[PDB]
Design a protein around this nucleic acid. Structure first.
Length: 316
DNA sequence: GTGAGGTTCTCTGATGGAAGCATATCGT
DNA sequence: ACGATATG
RNA sequence: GUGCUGCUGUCUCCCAGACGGGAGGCAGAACUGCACCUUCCAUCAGAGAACCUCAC
């Protein structure tokens, strides 16, 4: 259940503008790098309209520029990674249930991501059993730690073991263009994965061109979440307006939204479940009351004007 | 002076896709 | 109890 | 804030012209009047303008 609106902001500082204009280039690099790992020549649609054909040579050169010295040898593994990121694996046993989860092995030198099992079913039953007559070796002598290694050595989702294969070869940590923190990288990679997933669903529907992200031509949402998908934000009201401030690494960025007749007489309260409860009336004639929990807003620059897309959740 | 048959620009409509986070443990 | 990754 | 309409605003176009009216484009807003889930992508059908030749 979703319901969206749009609030205009006219005094965005330099920090948010640079964050919006710097998230796009990381997204574009993610799109081109995933296509490079895919190692399948494709068609690129430029801004003015031109379906150029890009072959394996430029793909290999781009991969070399990304740190993959000899993509010919690791071709059995780069491709095996990309299909995992673009959700081309089995619907069950996804190596990355959310695509943005992948940018910790790809773009973090000291990460140690692959050796985790605390959320693996099997370590949940044994730990709930320490503190054979139940429905599901290691039950004797207890030690769920050992079951962790038993379930990490085997039961490895394809593309996650493949990702760990390259890190020993010193080629997988890829130098992205800008030094975005984990959260903004995850937001950008979520957007890029969404755009390439749509592209591939269209390419297999046809059987064909790729449009890269642009700050003005084909904008994407620089999304701000409350659980690590993007930089955090907090919403409130002051009179008849919206007070939206985000928590960028350069500090807090506060912003006052010009009044909206869609959101009139606003009352806002923070919730203990990572959300903000807001009330409003639709103005016009009937002032029917609505309750909305907001958890993740978006930012889009259209016609030179900055708009936050307030995507809230209403009562069903 | 129109009809007919081809490019070359601005648009609008319909049917597809990707979407708008939950939990979990560990170290302080 | 709260923040830092990790991943359902 | 967004399609619709609305200068207390602007620019431009056309018809009578020295009374006005009829096209469009922005600024809107601090002016109502009906409503408002939306962003991006790729296809396919349809409608408009104009462009070139050859025929009647």
């Amino acid at each position: 259940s979703y319901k969206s609106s749009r609030v205009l902001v006219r005094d965005v500082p330099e920090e948010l503008v640079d964050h919006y204009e710097r998230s796009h280039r990381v997204a574009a690099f993610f799109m081109r790098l995933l296509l490079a790992m895919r190692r399948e020549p494709y068609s690129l649609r430029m801004r003015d309209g031109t379906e150029r054909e890009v072959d394996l040579d430029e793909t290999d050169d781009f991969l070399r520029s990304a740190g993959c010295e000899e993509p010919d040898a690791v071709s059995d593994d780069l491709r095996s990674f990309a299909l995992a990121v673009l959700h081309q694996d089995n619907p069950k046993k996804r190596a990355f249930l959310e695509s943005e989860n992948c940018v910790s092995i790809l773009c973090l030198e000291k990460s140690a991501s692959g050796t985790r099992y605390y959320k693996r079913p099997g370590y949940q039953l044994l730990k709930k059993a320490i503190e054979d007559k139940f429905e599901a070796r290691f039950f004797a002598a207890r030690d769920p730690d050992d079951l962790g290694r038993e379930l990490l050595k085997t039961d490895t989702r394809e593309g996650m073991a493949a990702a760990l294969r390259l890190r020993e070869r010193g080629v997988f940590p890829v130098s992205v263009p800008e030094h975005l923190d984990l959260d903004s990288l995850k937001a950008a990679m979520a957007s890029a994965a969404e755009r390439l997933k749509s592209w591939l669903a269209c390419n297999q529907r046809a059987v064909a061109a790729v449009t890269l992200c642009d700050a003005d031509d084909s904008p994407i949402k620089v999304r701000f979440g409350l659980t690590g998908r993007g930089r955090k934000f907090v919403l409130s009201a002051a009179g008849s307006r919206f007070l939206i401030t985000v928590k960028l690494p350069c500090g807090d960025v506060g912003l006052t939204a010009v009044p909206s007749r869609y959101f009139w007489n606003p009352s806002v309260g923070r919730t203990t479940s990572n959300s903000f409860r807001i009330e409003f009336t639709k103005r016009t004639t009937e002032n029917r009351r609505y309750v909305g929990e907001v958890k993740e807003i978006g930012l889009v620059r259209q016609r030179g004007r900055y708009y936050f897309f307030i995507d809230y959740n209403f009562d069903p």
